[PDB]
Amino acid sequence: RSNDPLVDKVIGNAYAVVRAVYCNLGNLKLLYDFLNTYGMVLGVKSEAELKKLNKLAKYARVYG
Amino acid sequence: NAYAVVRAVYCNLGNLKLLYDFLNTYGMVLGVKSEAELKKLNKLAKYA
Amino acid sequence: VDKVIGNAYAVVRAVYCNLGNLKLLYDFLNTYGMVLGVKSEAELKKLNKLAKYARVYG
Amino acid sequence: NAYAVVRAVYCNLGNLKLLYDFLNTYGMVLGVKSEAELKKLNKLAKYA
Amino acid sequence: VDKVIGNAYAVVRAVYCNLGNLKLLYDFLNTYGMVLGVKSEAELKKLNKLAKYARVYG
Amino acid sequence: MRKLSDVYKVLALTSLKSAGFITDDKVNIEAWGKPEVLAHINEGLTRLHSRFVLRTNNCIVEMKEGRTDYPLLARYSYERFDPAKAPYPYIMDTPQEPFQEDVIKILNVYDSKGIRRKLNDDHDKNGLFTPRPDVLQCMWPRHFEALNVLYQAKHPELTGDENQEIDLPETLYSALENWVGYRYHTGLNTEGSTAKAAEYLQLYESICGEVVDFDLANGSMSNTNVLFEKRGWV
Amino acid sequence: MRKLSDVYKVLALTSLKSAGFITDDKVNIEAWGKPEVLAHINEGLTRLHSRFVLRTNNCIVEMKEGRTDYPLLARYSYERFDPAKAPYPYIMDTPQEPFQEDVIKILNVYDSKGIRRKLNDDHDKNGLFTPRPDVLQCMWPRHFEALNVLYQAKHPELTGDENQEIDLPETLYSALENWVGYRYHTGLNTEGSTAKAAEYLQLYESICGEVVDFDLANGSMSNTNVLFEKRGWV
Amino acid sequence: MRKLSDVYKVLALTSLKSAGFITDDKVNIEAWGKPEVLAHINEGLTRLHSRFVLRTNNCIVEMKEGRTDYPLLARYSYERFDPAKAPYPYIMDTPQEPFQEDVIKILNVYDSKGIRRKLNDDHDKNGLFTPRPDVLQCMWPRHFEALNVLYQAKHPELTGDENQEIDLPETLYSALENWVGYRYHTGLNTEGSTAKAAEYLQLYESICGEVVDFDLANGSMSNTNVLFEKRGWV
Amino acid sequence: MRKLSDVYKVLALTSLKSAGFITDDKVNIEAWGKPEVLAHINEGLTRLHSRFVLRTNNCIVEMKEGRTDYPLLARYSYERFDPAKAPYPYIMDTPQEPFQEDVIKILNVYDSKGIRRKLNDDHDKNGLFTPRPDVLQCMWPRHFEALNVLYQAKHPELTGDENQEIDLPETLYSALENWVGYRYHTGLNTEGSTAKAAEYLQLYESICGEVVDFDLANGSMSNTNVLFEKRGWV
Amino acid sequence: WNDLMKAEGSAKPPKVKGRSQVQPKLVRRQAEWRYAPLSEPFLSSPKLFKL
């Protein structure tokens, strides 16, 4: 009833990446939730896309 | 389907590694413009 | 505890069930342009492929 | 007759490919001579 | 769903049952002269054998 | 797990000792007969990996709709896809362990659901016939399927690199040497060399007999009699 | 699945090593004996594909009214139609896999309706007699018919192109070499070469015996006893 | 179905390799020994077509009133009528497939009504005796009759044209060569050549034994036991 | 427990006495054939350690999550970790007794809890299959596990240092010499030396037969019949 | 007990292709060789109960 040999066959050596992600689902969810709060500066190319931002944009930095 | 789940994870292995690295590399510059809220930043927030 | 479907397969399945949330995170990273801070050039060279804008804190 | 159906499809394989390509190549010029009906053209209608 | 007569054979039969409609479409393409629009010469070279008239949008 | 460089040296001291291409230091083989020796080791491992079940490997084969015949070559794999000779890839291999085109005999194939499918069973829908040893003919490519194909395998082909590692039991190296000696000494067409080739070839069987007379290559098999409870027999 | 170019090289190092036409680099065969070697490989594969059932292929044969004898040659096929020697084509092959005139023995022929027709049954209407191995005599060419003829096959003829790929099990390459060596060494009519030909030919049987003593060519067959339920025997 | 031109070339590379008449390109036979080789192929096919049942053909024989003995020669046929040695033609052949005088053994003869007539049955009116292998003695030439005579056949005589196609199974070409080699090498009357002739002749039997040990020439026969229901046995 | 330096001397006086590289004092081997002799002792011990069960050793294998195939090589050990070819170490060895890559056959593996797990049992969850002699396929790497793997072992590889001690029974040294003599004398390809190689090789079997005919290598085994009480049988 | 009586359910022999699935009904035989002797005493007299 163990499907572990399949993981060894397919994701054998690179299983460390999956384990590191798994240990960090809570951290990733917290990162996404903070990301949606828009409490940061966002890089924008030209003035045109500056308008194309969420009603919650709080900082922006335009390059060119 | 065990094979379907394993293949779906494997085909997205690079994106998983990218997300995990971005979480570890976390250095997004946060704008505060105020010391009070700057002091109220989380422990992982470097660069402001 | 010791899982019956395999210890690593449980982890793989748990990651699989959360792909949608990870898909939203990846999309938000990809479409909204991001500027990040970097200590040196070596760390700057070691940035991901969706990082368009950076800042080297010398 | 499975063989009859398969052979009937196979002997018309080139015409099927031609029809599918024409559907993908779809570029027939449509005459409108009016902006209103020209704005009322379908999404796949290029060239007018 | 998983067909009993074979997954690809179902598709082949479905195409077969619609040959008459495809025959009418092929006939209408063949007899009524058609003029089509083309972007370049390479795409113009890649036209079907029943295309008598064309137009290269430069 | 020795290296091809070491095999060259050990061959130069035991089997190909009187050979001409032995270098002046006696511990290596000259660069003009190396293609010849390498073409003998590759055949040597193939024979040894054919008699004994030395390398049992399984490669999963995804189902592509419209395809029933599934050759198990390396051109159809994922990491070694060859667009010139394969329309789509359907075998699955990881970058660290790519498919090496090393199927000698196919032994037992399971499914993506866990259902074992019989091999070469004329009256058996749900049976995968093999019309030629390195092929597979599934007569119903159902949706979302795959096939873990347990097969007898040969050693991956030795290209010629002197850093490629050789997978042979340590007890069977005295038989690989006695087969390289046979192949080499039998081509000279001289009476003295031909008579030595027979001795080296016969010694190959003697060592390959002592390996099977002591179960050093895992040939003996015992299994639980699961048939007993199924046929009744309380 | 090796190539004829590789077979030339591997032949030049093991079997035809003392042969005259071996080039100065020892890793190829000169352009004057290549027709000879190619005529030995083609015979070699034919013998190997005759003893063992190595290539089982089926080619469907459409019914043309008024024709009962249906030779399974390549002149009657669709992609290789020869109007000079065939009135109409009745075999069916795709451009990627044309008929290669490679029928050794015909084993089992089905119909367009799924009804199996017996072979060489004197008292059996609905039976396809074969008056010569590469023919077929259907005594009632019914309307809308066809015949999937499962037959033993030989390797497609090697024209001489050095890019044609050879379909042989990896374990049987040590027997193809020992048959090329036999054919080559037996024609020189010298006492030394003749005595070597016998050794190479006998080794061909020894390797062809080890392949059949370990089921490396899929010779053993097991089938479900469907006869049991039909004869009664509740 | 190879050609006599190809048989010349394949003979020049395997069996008659040390022969004198081999041309400078080694891929053909000189124009002075070709009658000799052709006279050996013709005998070779005759022997091969005699042991195995390779070509079963039937030629219908119309009844002419007043004639009971019906030799199955080619002078009595329709397309090859010879007025100098035959009074009237009674065999029936089409222009595309004329009678080739190729009867080795007569096996089973039917009638124009479908009644099978026994062969060599002393007490059996309605029996066609054969007083010599290529004859037929019907003792009652009834009106409106004919006889489909199923007989073992030999390959049609090879005149010498290099475009005549040869009907031999591909697996039996390694035995035709070993018989041409026997006939050629045994006539030189030299000790070296004679000892090679025995080896080539014995190999002919070995290959002709492997063909009959694997049913590659259709020698095994199975028939429905129609006798069972006739003798009673409900 | 003799030393390789002593083995050189004892070889120079009994087996390789007429050898060329014997130094002027007759009690040592010259520095140009020592690689050759060392490559013969290493093979000699491998054969002797293969037939008889001379060295039974167990190396525990910790479980790492996500890994099912557990090759028992030296690159995966702790004291000989090779970061270039192994992601993490999972075997466990002490600095005084590191893993020597000396597994010939795996015999019996226990667990960290004391539960014996069967080997090569198709229908046996809790069974460790070995897909190749020096590997291990545990299908359920449970938490906090390990595997004491009792296996047949070979002598640790003799690098060439003249202070490395050799683990051979004193009664079997008359067979190691007779195998070094065989390997050395059989490579000279001379009629006189070849005939001596056969005598030395046959004497190897004779001494290896007297060792097994007197239980000097611990081959006979007796065990308590624990099966009796389990099957009932009060 | 009832399943053992008529060879069905738990006692149903497994049907695999080729081999038989015949199960002799020993329990049923023993039960039928006892149904009749135990029932006749009640059916032998014109009056069943005697008081």
Q: Which residues of I touch F (CB under 8 A)?
A: 32-33, 35-36, 39-40, 43, 46-47, 50-51, 73, 101-102, 104-105, 120-124, 130-134, 154, 183, 186-189, 191, 194, 198
Task: Please answer yes or no on whether C37 and B19 come within 8 Å at the CB atom.
Answer: no
Q: If we measure between CA atoms, which residue out of H104, F47, I159 comes closest to residue G207?
A: F47
Interface contacts C/I by beta carbons within 8 Å: 11
| Three-point CA angle J47, J50, J51, nearest 5° | 145
Please report residues of I whose CB lies closer than 8 A to that of F15.
187
Tell me the one-letter amino acid at I97.
E
Residues G174, F49: Cα–Cα separation, whole Å = 13
Chains touching chain D at 3 or more Cβ pairs under 8 angstroms? E, G
- Decide: helix, strand or coil at residue H37: helix
Task: Please answer yes or no on whether G228 and J18 come within 8 Å at the CB atom.
Answer: yes
Instruction: Determine the distance in angstroms separating the CA of G56 from the nearest CA of chain H, rounded to an integer.
Output: 14
G41 contacts G5 by C-beta, under 8 angstroms: no
Helix residue ranges per DSSP H, chain I: 4-14, 34-51, 173-185, 191-210, 227-230
Q: Helices (H), strands (E): how many in chain E?
A: 3, 2
| Interface membership of E56 toward D (CB under 8 Å) | no
Residues H177, H37: Cα–Cα separation, whole Å = 11
**I149 DSSP β-pair partners:** I59, I109
| Interface membership of E24 toward D (CB under 8 Å) | no
| Interface membership of B31 toward A (CB under 8 Å) | yes
Residues F128, F120: Cα–Cα separation, whole Å = 7
Q: CB G182: neighbour CB atoms within 10 A? A: 24
Q: If we measure between CA atoms, which residue out of F7, F44, F78 comes closest to residue F154?
A: F44
Which chain C residues in 7-36 lie under 8 Å from chain I, judged by CB atoms?
7-8
Give the helix/strand (H/E) hosting A41: strand A41-45
Residues H91, H80: Cα–Cα separation, whole Å = 10
| Interface membership of B2 toward A (CB under 8 Å) | yes
Which chain J residues in 27-46 lie under 8 Å from chain G, judged by CB atoms?
none
User: The tokens of F224 are what?
Assistant: 């639980």
Nearest CA in chain J to G229: J18
Please report residues of G whose CB lies closer than 8 A to that of H15.
187
Please report residues of I whose CB lies closer than 8 A to that of A2.
139-140
State whether the Cα torsion B11-B17-B23-B29 is positive or negative: negative
**Strand F56-60 relative to strand E53-56, pairing:** unpaired
Residues G167, E21: Cα–Cα separation, whole Å = 45
- Decide: helix, strand or coil at residue I11: helix
Instruction: Determine the distance in angstroms separating the CA of B1 from the nearest CA of chain F, rounded to an integer.
Output: 7
Residues I97, I115: Cα–Cα separation, whole Å = 26
Residues I187, G38: Cα–Cα separation, whole Å = 35
Residues B29, B41: Cα–Cα separation, whole Å = 12
What distance lies between CA A26 and its chain's CA centroid? 12
Please report residues of F whose CB lies closer than 8 A to that of B1.
112-113, 144
Nearest CA in chain I to C11: I66
Q: Which residue has the tokens 């007899």?
A: E31
Residues H197, G186: Cα–Cα separation, whole Å = 11
User: In this structure, what are the phi and psi dihedrals at residue I198, rounded to the nearest 5 degrees?
Assistant: -65, -40
| Interface membership of A59 toward C (CB under 8 Å) | no
C56 contacts C38 by C-beta, under 8 angstroms: yes
Extract long-range pairs of J29-33: CB within 8 Å, 24+ residues apart.
J31/J5
| Interface membership of D1 toward G (CB under 8 Å) | yes
Residues G1, F135: Cα–Cα separation, whole Å = 12
Residues C40, H151: Cα–Cα separation, whole Å = 96
Residues H97, G66: Cα–Cα separation, whole Å = 16
Please report residues of C whose CB lies closer than 8 A to that of A41.
35
F187 contacts G17 by C-beta, under 8 angstroms: yes
B29 contacts C36 by C-beta, under 8 angstroms: yes
**F59 DSSP β-pair partners:** F149
Residues F164, F156: Cα–Cα separation, whole Å = 10
What distance lies between CA A48 and its chain's CA centroid? 25
DSSP D34: S
Task: Please answer yes or no on whether G131 and H55 come within 8 Å at the CB atom.
Answer: yes
| Interface membership of J17 toward G (CB under 8 Å) | yes
H151 contacts H107 by C-beta, under 8 angstroms: yes
DSSP H163: T
| Interface membership of A1 toward F (CB under 8 Å) | no
Residues H74, F157: Cα–Cα separation, whole Å = 62
User: What approach was used to elucidate this structure?
Assistant: cryo-EM
Per-state percent for chain C, helix, strand, coil, to nearest 5: 50, 15, 35
Tell me the one-letter amino acid at H216.
L
Instruction: Determine the distance in angstroms separating the CA of B6 from the nearest CA of chain C, rounded to an integer.
Output: 7
Q: If we measure between CA atoms, which residue out of I89, I142, I137 comes closest to residue I109?
A: I137
Task: Please answer yes or no on whether I65 and C8 come within 8 Å at the CB atom.
Answer: yes
Residues H75, H82: Cα–Cα separation, whole Å = 5
Nearest CA in chain I to F209: I51
DSSP D28: B
Q: Which residue has the tokens 């070697």?
A: G37
Tell me the one-letter amino acid at D33.
K
Instruction: Determine the distance in angstroms separating the CA of F225 from the nearest CA of chain J, rounded to an integer.
Output: 16
Please report residues of G whose CB lies closer than 8 A to that of H196.
189, 194
Please report residues of D whose CB lies closer than 8 A to that of E26.
15, 18-19
Extract long-range pairs of H15-23: CB within 8 Å, 24+ residues apart.
H15/G187, H15/H177, H15/H178, H15/H180, H15/H181, H15/H184, H15/H200, H16/G187, H16/H180, H16/H181, H16/H184, H17/G36, H17/G187, H17/G188, H17/G189, H18/G187, H18/G188, H18/G189, H19/H184
Residues I24, I28: Cα–Cα separation, whole Å = 8
| Interface membership of B4 toward A (CB under 8 Å) | no
User: The tokens of F132 are what?
Assistant: 């030629």
**H69 DSSP β-pair partners:** H137
Task: Please answer yes or no on whether H13 and G105 come within 8 Å at the CB atom.
Answer: no
Judge A/C contact: 3 or more CB pairs < 8 A.
Answer: yes
Residues J33, H213: Cα–Cα separation, whole Å = 61
Q: Resolution in angstroms, to 1 decimal, for this deposition?
A: 3.7
Residues G35, I126: Cα–Cα separation, whole Å = 59
Instruction: Determine the distance in angstroms separating the CA of J21 from the nearest CA of chain G, rounded to an integer.
Output: 8
Per the document, the length of chain H is 234
